[PDB]
Amino acid sequence: QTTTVYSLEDLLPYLKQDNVDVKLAPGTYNVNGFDVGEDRLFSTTPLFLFEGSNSTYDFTDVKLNINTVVLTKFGNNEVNEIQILGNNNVLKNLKLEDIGTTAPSNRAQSIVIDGRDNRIEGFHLTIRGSYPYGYGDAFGKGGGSVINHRKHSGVLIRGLRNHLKDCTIISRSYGHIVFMQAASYPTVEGCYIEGEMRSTDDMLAEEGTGSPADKVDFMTVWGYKLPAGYMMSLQEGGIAAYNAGTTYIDGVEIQRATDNPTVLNCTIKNARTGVTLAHANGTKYVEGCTVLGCENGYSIGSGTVVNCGADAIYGPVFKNTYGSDKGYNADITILPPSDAYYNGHDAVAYIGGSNHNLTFRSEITEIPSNLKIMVSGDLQGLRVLHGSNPSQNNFAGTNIVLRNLTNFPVDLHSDSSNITVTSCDTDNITDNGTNNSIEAIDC
């Protein structure tokens, strides 16, 4: 029943059909600029548009090389390499690599998952080609940028009950690695997700070169000159959910927030955030995850983070996003450093909002003097200085259980109230709050 094809040309008609079982034969397939045009292999974008439903596509031992010049061959329009519009499809085992670093004319996504009940499993994706590449989001990630951007993100999960499973996603592009827009019940499971980092000090060393950042005197979109002493991802979110998107399911165009996301047994390295789901609605659940060398570890707003780890070399392992955060329950291990420390945020965690139950565990004995668990206060976060992003900083925390099974110090700010703290040591706890309880635990 499986049909095997031996070229991209013979693959494309099956994408339009329902209930097919198709295999693209092992080999290397190249997509170049000359493959785009009216009489060419790819006359439209998305390049591979999966419109059928109830189909299975096997890409075992397939290497698909897409030249990044293709991101410029469709005018000033978004280019998606793969988009799934149908339902109940399974795509497996493709190795997809962007060749070169040519930026999109507008913007690009490697994979977009619409429809419902689709699964992409076992893919190996390498994302390349974006502008500007080397500043993270310092000079703009949305409208009103200081340096105008041509972003290129990895996997965009939308639709309903769509599933990214056992994939490796490597990004060397300015964009999210895995993100969700208008996705209901998305699941990310068993994935390895990886960006790369650059220090703000290395960016500031562009002074006098005539670089794009040098020409704006390093004035960030946050309203201040780029501060020294931070490590930034060149990517955006590793696994990030946003509240405003459009998706299509069964011909219906839907504009909604992401809801009910689940993230299981993923490892996320060198992204702006490990897992951020604060903007998603419904039930948020994160379990078994490992976050290494990200600017922020876990920020889900409300829900459960359990049996998860993060190191603190570049930023806090935990952050409450807003003072509106309620019901965030977490059990997070602060992992040994994956690399040298370079944490300009002066915090291992920033806690606020209300009715949280937070446990931190760690075997670390070598504690950098600037790292502390903060409950309320003025976070020295890269994007929240000098009143920038004001709702994400300087807010109160009330009625929170904090179980500090670590050697990290704790600072309870004046805006903290009714914090129930238990800690291995109470001598390194500063309490300036109201009606807080501090009790010692024996290891």
Numbering used by the authors: 1 to 443
How do the authors describe this structure?
FdlA from Flavobacterium sp. SA-0082 is an endo-type fucoidan-degrading enzyme that cleaves the sulfated fuco-glucuronomannan (SFGM) through a lytic mechanism. Our structural, biochemical, and enzymological analyses strongly suggest that FdlA-NTD utilizes catalytic residues different from other β-helix polysaccharide lyases, potentially representing a novel polysaccharide lyase family. Here, we report crystal structures and enzymological characterization of wild type (WT) and eight single mutants of the catalytic N-terminal domain (NTD) of FdlA, revealing its unique substrate binding pocket and identifying the key catalytic residues.
We first measured the enzymatic activity of 12 mutants and found that eight of them (D137A, K141A, H176A, F179A, E236A, R240A, Y242A, and Y242F) almost completely abolished their activities, H279A mutant retained approximately 65% of the activity compared with WT, while mutations of Asn243, Arg272, and Tyr322 to Ala only negligibly affect their activities. Two positively charged residues Lys141 and Arg240 have their side chains pointing closely to the C-5 atom at the +1 subsite, hence are potential candidates for a catalytic base. In contrast, the R240A mutant exhibits visible structural changes around the active site. Specifically, the Try242 residue was rotated approx. 90 degrees, and shifted toward Ala240. As it constitutes the catalytic acid, the hydroxyl group of the Tyr242 side chain is essential for the enzymatic activity, and its improper positioning may severely affect the catalysis of the enzyme. These structures suggested that the loss of activity of the R240A mutant may be due to the shift of the Tyr242 side chain. Next, the positively charged residues including Arg240 and His176, which are located near the +1 subsite, neutralize the C-5 carboxyl group of D-GlcUA at +1 subsite, thus reducing the pKa of the C-5 proton, making it more susceptible to the attack by a base.
